[PDB]
Amino acid sequence: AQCEATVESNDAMQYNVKEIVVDKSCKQFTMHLKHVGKMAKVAMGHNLVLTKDADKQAVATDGMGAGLAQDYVKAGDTRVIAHTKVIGGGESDSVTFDVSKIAAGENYAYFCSFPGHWAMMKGTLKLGS
Ligand SMILES: [Cu+]
């Protein structure tokens, strides 16, 4: 609703939403992430990272090497448009980004960069109204 969306992540390594459509009327957009499971962030942590589809694996790979304290996102990665912190069960986080950083027709992927999660936790985000 409005210029925001909510994605729930669980203990089975899955997002409940696979596609997010950003309305052209939005100048800013907010992504809310909820970890609805009961596992600790050291075993089943989740975040939400947004990049062009092409940059997915590269960003997830470098992110793994950043560590948990860095929310598994390489500090100052220019390929990441927006990202939340890594959360454990019973928690949540939000991230707001500039819609101008998004282009029509372009393909964007949101995924979890916690080690090994990217291969199963991913969705598509795009501008469209
Ligand atoms: Cu995850």
Swiss-Prot record:
Molecular function in Gene Ontology: copper ion binding; electron transfer activity
PROSITE patterns (UniProt xref): COPPER_BLUE
Residues annotated for Cu cation binding in this entry: 46, 112, 117, 121
Recorded GO CC terms: periplasmic space
Pfam family, one: Copper-bind
Entry's localization field: Periplasm
Domain Plastocyanin-like: 1-129
Disulfide bonding pattern of the chain: 3-26
Keyword Transmembrane helix carried by entry: no
Listed InterPro entries: Azurin (IPR014068), BlueCu_1 (IPR000923), BlueCu_1_BS (IPR028871), Cu-binding_ET (IPR050845), Cupredoxin (IPR008972)
Keywords: Copper, Disulfide bond, Electron transport, Metal-binding, Periplasm, Transport
Function recorded in the entry: Transfers electrons from cytochrome c551 to cytochrome oxidase.
Matches recorded under NCBIfam families: azurin (TIGR02695)
Protein name per the record: Azurin-2
